[PDB]
Amino acid sequence: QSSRYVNLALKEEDLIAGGEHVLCAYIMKPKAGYGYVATAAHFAAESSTGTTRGVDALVYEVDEARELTKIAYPVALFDRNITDGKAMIASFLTLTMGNNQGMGDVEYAKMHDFYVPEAYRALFDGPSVNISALWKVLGRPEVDGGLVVGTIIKPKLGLRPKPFAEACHAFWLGGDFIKNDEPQGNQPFAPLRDTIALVADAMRRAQDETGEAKLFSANITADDPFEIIARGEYVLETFGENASHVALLVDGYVAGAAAITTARRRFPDNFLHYHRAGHGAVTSPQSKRGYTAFVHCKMARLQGASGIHTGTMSSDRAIAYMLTQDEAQGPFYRQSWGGMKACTPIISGGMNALRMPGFFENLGNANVILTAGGGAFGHIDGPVAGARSLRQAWQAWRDGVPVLDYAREHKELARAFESFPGDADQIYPGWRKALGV
Amino acid sequence: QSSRYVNLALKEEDLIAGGEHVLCAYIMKPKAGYGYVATAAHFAAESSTGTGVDALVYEVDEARELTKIAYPVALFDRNITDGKAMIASFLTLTMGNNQGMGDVEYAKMHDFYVPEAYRALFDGPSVNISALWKVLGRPEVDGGLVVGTIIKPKLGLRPKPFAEACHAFWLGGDFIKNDEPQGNQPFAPLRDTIALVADAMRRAQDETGEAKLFSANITADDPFEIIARGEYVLETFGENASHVALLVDGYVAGAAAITTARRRFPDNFLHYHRAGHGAVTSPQSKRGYTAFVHCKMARLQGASGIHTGTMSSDRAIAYMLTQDEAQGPFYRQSWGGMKACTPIISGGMNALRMPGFFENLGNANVILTAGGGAFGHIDGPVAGARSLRQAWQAWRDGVPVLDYAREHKELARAFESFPGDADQIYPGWRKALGV
């Protein structure tokens, strides 16, 4: 304790520059009455060695008031593969937020950020492919290729194989990407093999009447990796030609990191779509327990997700940057990735075509995947035209064209104006004037 | 929603009866000023369909904060390979995305019921304490208490000093395990440490004349590296390979880590360590699930053992985890002969507290992973672990500890090492023991 796991004269800058320590930031409160630096010596020790050769997890800073504890964890602490040489997220959480999360002399404790040094960062998988792979299928520039418009298949469950394939076919006449909702698997009333053979078919017909390549994200989530692998393999070989048009969804939260690592290493040539199925209590309203969505997501790039459900509503734009850039500033630490492929944000929502440009402007790009509600798709003409206006709104954004001038020569974007006339004045006044009328 | 997803005229006996509906029970409170029933009907819609097959709320109590929902077994995914159930599904459908909601504040799963048809498609344990009992050369029916410890400290001991600390302990105790993180650190690699721990096993087993057990951590991210440690660790114990428990940190690596171990090494004790959990499991969390549901879920998955607690969490948990017919906070489960999951009690249980604990619990059929039951004895830790055995054998036999404590020194001395518990649990001890 105290003199053992507390070294408050440590410059965080030295530590970063040393490159031998992982640093963590938490917002923990010592139970009723307990010393502030004493508890943090204790939370450090339980995290560290129990009962000093740089095996000790030092407390380089505390901010009694703000309830801010920063701890430096030597990189040698962290387990590594016997096989690979490779680091693991399982170790990382075990040390960092393992049953230090269960103590009895700490009200609550939540990790807010973490720094990973080069020696350590580099032993991790990182993403194998991203949006970039999606773009190249879609015949877009692999660098800054833009917006990929998607839905989820509402209802979430209860559609037989054909109804389901037909919902897919239908949607792909406007849109680019469909993704199996969260529990869609191998229910008795709509078997995986029957559905995925049918859905395979719907791609062919959609592609052929459209002339555009279409995208599908199939969950292969399962308890057993060989089952996860079983699916990966039956899906990719049933899409055959269109094997590279399939993304593999794995509910990484609710099935653990071994599930995420199974697809990542098994199928490294396909987009690994990480569902954030239901963080809740951990990544929350400020569940004073576990970690935040910033950290959950930052952790996934290191793990190897290609894309991950990220945000709708300091922000999920901060998360976005940390995930996609080579240098990103988090709430407490600035991180470099020394050329580690980015993980594509998958925004959920449904802006609409007139609000779409707004989104892209604050973010600074449109290199996301949008899994829009059947709401973002609402239009007076429909979801085929709803989805087309979304596409149309990216091109005018991209190209620099005033939307309204572009709308004039673009039907569905034009008909959108009128589809949400309430938002048009607000955002863009005189639209009718320019013609809508 | 509402009307579609609710049907409060459904009797719970009836849904049990058909045994074609998974029933879950929650403590949820809708947000700001949303109807109780409505919110629940929406939550039923969020888990299930949304647009039986449809998930139907069959019992509400707004005053108590209770939503009880009936999910048809049809909704629950299964393997294309096996034809078998999966926990990930049980979790995505009844816990998930559904977790997150607006109009929904908190909802915690407090208990669940798995029909007959559906409970039978899960893996369930493969081995349990009777495997440990059979190696320690005990009865596989009421074989009793297994004395263990976490080797301390957590990390830092090099291959050799680790091996030698292990050997020390194994001269007085039975089970030794690896800590939340010990593995393949640079300063104490796994191959070097497992190789040398294998020897310390053979040595102490030779000196002592007793079979001893080790619990080796094989947790990892990649299932093929979990298997690799698994295989390395048993290849190196050679002959003593039925003595190795395989410890998987199932909360932190997930369902897939648990099931890689359970299915690839079915003949070894799958020790399920729940480091973490405290977040979602918190008794101060109003989200996720309770410890009862955590561990009820584990039997199904197939852990052979699970860290259970010390202190209707555990008393109820213990019976749920080991009986073939246990009663939970809301539902009565029947497990149709699915093997048990041994509690693994941890904490500071000296030899004085042992007796009562076995009297409340009713058996001594658990593994104890001692620290200050052991390392706390005035005469050292070997002496400490010998004091626990002795307290156990006392209880077992019907000998009354002060009695058993006269013929046995380690036990005479427990009382001397924790006088607070002595004073308090055995009055007259000073006197009776004499000295």
From Swiss-Prot, chain A:
Its EC number is 4.1.1.39. The modification N6-carboxylysine is found at residue 179. Gene3D superfamilies: Ribulose bisphosphate carboxylase, large subunit, C-terminal domain (3.20.20.110), RuBisCO large subunit, N-terminal domain (3.30.70.150). Keywords: Calvin cycle, Carbon dioxide fixation, Lyase, Magnesium, Metal-binding, Monooxygenase, Oxidoreductase, Photosynthesis. One of its GO terms (molecular function) is magnesium ion binding. Binds 1 Mg(2+) ion per subunit. SUPFAM superfamilies: RuBisCo, C-terminal domain, RuBisCO, large subunit, small (N-terminal) domain. The active site is at residues 154, 275. GO terms for biological process: reductive pentose-phosphate cycle. Its cofactor is Mg(2+). The keyword Nucleotide-binding does not apply. It is an enzyme of class 4 (lyase). Mg(2+) binds at residues 179, 181-182. Homodimer. The basic functional RuBisCO is composed of a large chain homodimer in a 'head-to-tail' conformation. In contrast to form I RuBisCO, the form II RuBisCO are composed solely of large subunits. This is Ribulose bisphosphate carboxylase.
